[PDB]
Design a protein around this nucleic acid. Structure first.
Length: 236
DNA sequence: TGAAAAGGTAAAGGAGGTCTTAAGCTCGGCTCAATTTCTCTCTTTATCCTGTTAGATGGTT
């Protein structure tokens, strides 16, 4: 297969330069503009390499790297740190983050490609983020576009179950079995209650839900806009 | 057009986890006698070396 590289950087210009140069080198590149989305993508995709900028918003690059090292699924993924390199203290804190390498900005493209090759020569399953939602399992929270929403455990698990089947209709019996482990024949009415809470937290108008749709006779569907349309929905 | 038939919403109540205090304990620190190691001297043995002037001169079992 083509090696998967995850680039995590809030500088869209650096992110684009890197992505273009890696694609020219034949890799499958994935991009993330912030540390939370980057972490979710790393967990979901298990990329073959992570390039990790230092100064990401809401979550510093060090905390992201440490969390990747704490997850058994990502602990072995090589981390090439992108750093603005200027103070020995960021040096000292990176010395504990478990980074595999550092690359100082500005970098030569050839050096970047050399490091990518060396890390790859050395190395040799749940959707947690789609469009406007990051799910934050560790905190039972959802990032919905740019707002934090606190969820209860059952509401979170229900929303995750729907996210796993984004764009498909999920039957109430499947929700009972997967989230509650209950028999298909138990009362599904309880689910109907908790679904509205998600709408209460997530829809702009709970009476005219746009994203948590009801498929009459079939169940519930989470339909999310593609990332290309997000700019039209945030104002809502 | 009337009528199932499903899907919502707003409660009441419970279930469950998370907080608050009076009772009691026991745990470490602090002091402070009370001592076992340590490290020098200071000896004191433990071990080896050399010499001995009457005369003597072939085995037991």
């Amino acid at each position: 297969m083509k090696p998967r590289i995850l680039v995590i950087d809030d500088d869209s210009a650096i992110l684009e330069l890197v992505a273009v140069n890696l694609e020219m080198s034949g890799y499958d590149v994935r991009k993330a503009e912030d540390g939370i989305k980057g972490q979710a993508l790393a967990v979901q995709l298990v990329p073959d390499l992570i390039m990790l900028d230092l100064m990401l918003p809401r979550v510093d690059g060090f905390t992201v790297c440490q969390r990747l090292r704490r997850d058994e699924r990502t602990a072995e993924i090589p981390v090439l740190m992108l750093t603005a390199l200027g103070q020995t203290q960021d040096k000292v804190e990176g010395f504990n983050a478990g980074a595999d390498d550092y690359l100082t900005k500005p970098f030569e493209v050839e050096e970047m490609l050399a490091r990518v090759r060396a890390l790859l020569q050395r190395t040799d399953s749940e959707i947690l983020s789609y469009g406007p939602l990051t799910l934050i399992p560790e905190r039972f929270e959802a990032i919905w576009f740019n707002r934090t929403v606190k969820l209860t455990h059952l509401e979170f698990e229900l929303l995750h179950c729907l996210l796993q089947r984004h764009g498909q209709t999920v039957a109430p019996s499947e929700i009972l079995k997967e989230v509650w482990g209950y028999d298909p024949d138990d009362d599904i009415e309880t689910i109907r209650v908790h679904i509205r809470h998600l709408r209460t937290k997530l829809e702009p108008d709970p009476r005219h839900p746009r994203y948590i749709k009801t498929v009459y006779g079939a169940g519930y569907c989470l339909e999310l806009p593609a990332e290309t349309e997000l700019h039209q929905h945030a104002d809502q």
